[PDB]
């Protein structure tokens, strides 16, 4: 077995907390874990208004990885849409990135714009979808930005329909507001194929997710074909959580790959 340092990246409304079953799994295979909290997510100080864009939202990724020491690398692992995050790290990172692994995330490429795929997300998603979440607008840095919060349904119903009520009990006590800068990203830089597109990618798809349904995940794969796949079965959304033990045999063979 290889020795790798696994960086794992939430999604929307969530945090590091999200990773609170695999991060110990994978340490005990012996395994560096770091598990962040982006901007105004999980426990971090910051509420969304303070947040203008996805780069900002990225910060704490970045920050951390400007301080990994020359010569690590690591393995980033981005659930949902943690996969635009990992994105936007790759491109300014990508020599300190040994592989990016997709788990029923969003895959941008560099062709179009970045906000591309959630263009696409959002056309074939029916608006009744998002049940009892709640959207909201903000002004930062001049721009007007949307905003969504999961509520308690939307999380019972789309999100974490497989999984007990004490897991889904912390997503209720815990889950924040956030964005996807969607109209922040419209105007922003395309993805390069010199930083985000060197790097390897892995993507795992889910086939029970009802946030990101199977044949969205399978469109994105399509779309940006990445270096390898995996299928997960029996995973909701939140498959970290109901197929940790899965993820964590699929993430050792991504170490002992790249
Ligand atoms: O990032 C997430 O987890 C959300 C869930 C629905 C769409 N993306």
Known sequence: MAFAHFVLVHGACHGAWSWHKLKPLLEALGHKVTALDLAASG???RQIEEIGSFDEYSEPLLTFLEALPPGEKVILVGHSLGGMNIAIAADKYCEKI????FLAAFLP????C??????????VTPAENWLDTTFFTYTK??????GMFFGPKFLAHKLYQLCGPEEYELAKMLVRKSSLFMNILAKRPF????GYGSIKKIYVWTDQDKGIPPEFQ???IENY?????????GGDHMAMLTKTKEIAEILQEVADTY
């Open 43 to 45: 426990v971090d100080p």
């Open 98 to 101: 040994a592989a990016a692994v």
């Open 109 to 112: 490429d560099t062709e179009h």
């Open 114 to 123: 970045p906000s591309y795929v959630l263009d696409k997300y959002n056309e």
């Open 141 to 146: 840095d001049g721009k007007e930005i949307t």
């Open 191 to 194: 993805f390069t194929k010199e």
């Open 218 to 220: 399978l469109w994105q």
């Open 225 to 233: 074909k990445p270096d390898k796949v995996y299928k997960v079965e």
